């Protein structure tokens, strides 16, 4: 308004100068950032002394002037000085104010209607508070603690994201007029944005603070700390008040934040799909990728794509690793040999060949690495630090707390190093059948011996006996391990050391881009294997909740419900741009041409034939009623259209529309067959399966011009077309052009025509036509 005119006058005055003009004319807008640093640069060494000296004065702060005049803030109440007309050297528009002035405002001053929005701004810390309040403390005890050092997360966070996925989110919720082009993360996560937008809209707020708080709300604070007991963010956030080196304040904190359940579900799904793709013989790679992209799952309220969560988590499991490898997702340098965990500290080497005779004379190749290399190893409640040297386990130290876990870790380590005579001459018990190739897929002798151990405890005992045994020398009695896993004995194993106190887990902030084979075995720029499908449980049955396996092979429904779902899908795919589609017809109010679509003609056979006319009447009625005015709900037409194909008739409609399979849908209420919500207006739930509706038009429920972006696209710039805003963008015609401003210092030309095709397929298929 008048303020706008003042801004224009100021811009004019500033351009009248020469230097300001040169700088606002030369270069791009990014220079602003640079200019933001050359100004207001001043620091202090010990702000503490300076603060005390400074606050001692009688008007130590600065403050706005007009805000005080408007706030009718006087210069005294009962004789205490509150501010004095004057000018700071830096701001030039601020006045020196007293500490007493702040107190004055809070006690009696300018009241505001409401302030509960704060609870949303700092939601993380109110969550901390609530989690604390729901704890039941317990006694306090004194003792020594085995605190192991390791990298963990201290901030419980749902839907952990990246940074590039945030810099955009902070705009569509706060600064939409200055928003950039729509990124994929937005189009995919629409309901999330809508939620974050519903709260911080039409409110008096400082927005920079909100953005900072949102960054914290989406940042898992990763720290390298000493830890004891279970590992959960709910605890690490207050570990300081649970136990130290000499004391422990017992307390139960198991039933809060429901975090690890999501991770175990994810890993179960990963295992399932990995096995599924393994069922194949030549395309398990593409099969797995398809299973991935053909799947989704629910998190709290929202539905997220699997491949998106997989690239955000950090669960180092032999399942997640494979998936993240297929999708080209980089990851850390962490190994996996069966259930155990491993990490290399130093050393090097290279592959080498050797052979062993299974029964009598049966040569079988097995490989082993060359020079000395250190490794840390982590099994359940047990740690170890060992060294391998030319097909032998040189030394090892342990700091666990259990005998069974100790023995299992030791055995798996011995295997990992091919130490012993068994790798020189396998036992009679094993045979060529147990060797490999369940159905053709070979197996290295390593995992063979692995399962041979997991089969019987006596195999493990014999394997341990393969390691040298001697008499426990004096003094080393404490640092010795028997066959049962006892901290001391009269005779103990060879080259072993024990101790109380776990080993400090190493650390490295490194990333690597690995690959995998057609047999589901990943490689890392070397012949080393980081993961496989033999190091995971064999199989198990589970009933996954709030998941969407939208793939034929990964489906249990029959042809009837599947046909209904596919008919709905096809009917939705006509929700794009261009004439002959439902949006253009709605705009033209041609409610009749919808009845003659081909998709309804393909879904008609599924309708109950003895009452198809009556239902048809009702459906057409609703459609006209919604179309003639303009007050329609897109989630009801897509539901009732399949019935408008036949001819109306007479009869009593009793509230429900039945198909030929004794499954109905009701016009207005959500059911198992067709459900949706105003929260997530971009999804349709049919028989549990989810369907993503494109964003071409926005009906009464949808919000803020974020529901038209999938209908627009970029085109060659045309200076003839007009320039408009982001709100009038809805009044354009399908197929028209218009110029527009995007983000900052950028103008482009858009056209309301979509392009459903992506680049994956086009790149993937075209690359397959070149390897011939």
């Amino acid at each position: 308004m008048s303020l706008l005119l003042t801004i224009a006058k100021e811009y004019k005055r500033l351009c009248q100068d020469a230097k300001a003009a040169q700088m606002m004319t030369v270069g791009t807008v990014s220079n602003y950032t640079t200019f933001k640093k050359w100004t207001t640069s001043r620091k202090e060494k010990n702000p503490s002394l300076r603060m005390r000296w400074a606050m001692s004065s009688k008007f130590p702060i600065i403050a706005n002037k007009r805000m005080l005049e408007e706030a009718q803030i006087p210069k005294e109440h009962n004789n205490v000085a509150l501010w004095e007309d004057t000018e700071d050297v830096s701001k030039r528009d601020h006045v020196l104010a007293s500490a007493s002035c702040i107190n004055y405002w809070n006690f009696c001053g300018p009241c505001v209607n409401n302030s509960e929005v704060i609870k949303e701004v700092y939601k993380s810390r109110f969550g901390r508070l609530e989690r604390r309040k729901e704890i039941m403390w317990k006694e306090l005890r004194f003792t020594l603690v085995d605190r192991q050092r390791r990298r963990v997360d201290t901030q419980p966070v749902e839907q952990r994201l990246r940074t590039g996925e945030i810099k955009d989110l902070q705009m569509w919720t706060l600064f939409e007029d200055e928003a950039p082009l729509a990124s994929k993360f937005i189009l995919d996560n629409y309901g999330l944005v809508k939620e974050m937008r519903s709260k911080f809209a039409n409110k008096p707020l400082n927005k920079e603070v909100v953005a900072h708080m949102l960054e914290k709300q989406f940042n898992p604070e990763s720290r390298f700390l000493p830890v004891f007991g279970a590992i959960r963010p709910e605890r690490m956030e207050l570990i300081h008040a649970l136990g130290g080196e000499t004391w422990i304040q017992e307390a139960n904190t198991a039933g809060i934040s429901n975090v690890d359940q999501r991770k175990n579900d994810i890993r179960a799904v990963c295992r399932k799909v990995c096995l599924a793709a393994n069922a194949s013989i030549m395309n398990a790679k593409s099969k797995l990728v398809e299973y991935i992209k053909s799947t989704s799952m629910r998190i709290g309220e929202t539905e997220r794509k699997l491949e998106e969560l997989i690239l955000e988590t950090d669960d180092v499991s032999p399942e997640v690793t494979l998936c993240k490898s297929a999708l080209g997702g980089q990851l850390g340098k962490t190994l996996s040999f069966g259930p155990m965990l491993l990490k290399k500290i130093s050393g090097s080497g290279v592959k080498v060949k050797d052979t062993v005779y299974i029964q009598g004379v049966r040569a079988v190749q097995f490989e082993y690495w060359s020079e000395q290399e250190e490794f840390y190893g982590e099994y359940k409640s047990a740690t170890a630090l060992f060294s391998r040297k030319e097909r032998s386990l040189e030394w090892i130290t342990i700091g666990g707390g259990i005998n069974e876990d100790r023995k299992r870790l030791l055995a798996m380590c011995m295997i990992f190093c091919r130490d012993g005579d068994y790798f020189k001459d396998a036992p009679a018990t094993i045979t060529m059948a147990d060797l490999s190739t369940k159905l053709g897929r070979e197996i290295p002798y390593q995992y063979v011996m692995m399962n041979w151990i997991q089969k019987s405890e006596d195999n493990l005992e014999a394997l341990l006996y393969s390691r040298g045994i001697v008499e426990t020398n004096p003094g080393k009695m404490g640092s010795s391990m028997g066959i049962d896993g006892s901290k001391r004995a009269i005779k103990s194993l060879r080259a072993v050391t024990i101790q109380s106190g776990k080993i400090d887990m190493p650390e490295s902030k490194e990333k690597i881009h690995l690959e995998l084979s057609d047999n589901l075995e990943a490689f890392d720029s070397s012949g080393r294997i980081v993961a496989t499908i033999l190091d995971l449980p064999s199989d198990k049955k589970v009933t996954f909740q709030d998941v969407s396996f939208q793939h034929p092979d990964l489906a249990v429904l029959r042809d009837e419900k599947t046909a209904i779902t596919k008919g709905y899908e096809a009917l939705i795919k006509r929700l794009g741009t261009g004439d002959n589609d439902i949006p253009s017809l709605i705009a033209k109010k041609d409610y009749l041409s919808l009845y003659n679509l081909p998709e309804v003609k393909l879904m008609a056979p599924l309708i109950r034939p003895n009452r198809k006319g009556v239902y048809s009447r009702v459906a057409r009625k609703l459609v006209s009623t919604q179309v003639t005015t303009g007050h329609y709900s897109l989630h009801e037409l897509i539901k009732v259209l399949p019935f408008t194909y036949f001819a109306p008739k007479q009869g009593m409609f009793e509230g429900r529309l039945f198909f030929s399979n004794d499954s109905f849908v009701e016009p207005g209420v959500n059911n198992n067959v067709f459900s949706w919500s105003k929260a997530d207006s971009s999804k349709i739930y049919c028989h549990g399966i989810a369907i993503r509706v494109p964003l071409v038009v926005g009906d009464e429920h949808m919000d803020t011009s974020l529901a038209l972006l999938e209908g627009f696209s970029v085109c060659e710039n045309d200076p003839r077309a007009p320039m408009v805003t982001r709100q009038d963008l809805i009044d354009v015609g399908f197929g028209q052009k218009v110029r527009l401003f995007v983000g900052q210092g950028s103008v482009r030309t858009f056209k309301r025509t979509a392009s459903q095709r992506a680049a994956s397929s086009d790149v993937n298929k075209n690359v397959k036509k070149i390897k011939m």
Binding site: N202, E700, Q727
Partner: protein
């Protein structure tokens, strides 16, 4: 969205003096307060405001030709005195889905001598004893209540 944009959109270049109907359902109004309404709307005879986070009806301007109103899905409570002065020619009213506790809040509606039908559903008042009868004895001019007259006579379509 927002009642302002909704209104400006419904007004497809039409003056706010020749319309006979308006609808603003599935919108939002800051502080549950009307925004964009004036006395300019004179020929308006119908209104529909549903699920807009409304809480009070103080701001609504003077509308005489109005003869039907809908305020369901909101959380209005207490302000029914404003309806008499602003809209004295009203006949049909609906409040199902709002915060209504006692009858003292309903008493002002007696002055709407032009009132014929009222709709109270899902409110606390309905959970009382002798509520239909006591209401009828309070508002005698009224004939229909939630779609049913005395003796439970179902009302016609329209």
């Amino acid at each position: 969205m927002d009642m302002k944009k909704r209104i400006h959109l419904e007004l497809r270049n039409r003056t706010p003096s020749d319309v006979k109907e308006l609808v603003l359902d599935n919108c939002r109004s800051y502080e549950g307060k009307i925004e964009g309404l004036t006395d300019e709307f004179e020929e308006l005879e119908f209104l529909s405001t549903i699920n807009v986070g409304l809480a009070s009806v103080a701001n609504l301007p003077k509308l005489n030709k109005l003869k039907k109103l809908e305020l369901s899905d909101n959380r209005v409570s207490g302000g029914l005195e404003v309806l008499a002065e602003k809209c004295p020619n009203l006949t049909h009213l609906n409040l199902s889905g709002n915060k209504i506790k006692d009858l003292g809040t309903i008493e002002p509606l007696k002055k709407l001598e032009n009132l014929k039908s009222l709709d109270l559903f899902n409110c606390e008042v309905t959970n009382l004893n002798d509520y239909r009868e006591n209401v009828f004895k309070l508002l005698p001019q009224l004939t229909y209540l939630d779609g049913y007259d005395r003796d439970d006579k179902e009302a016609p379509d329209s």
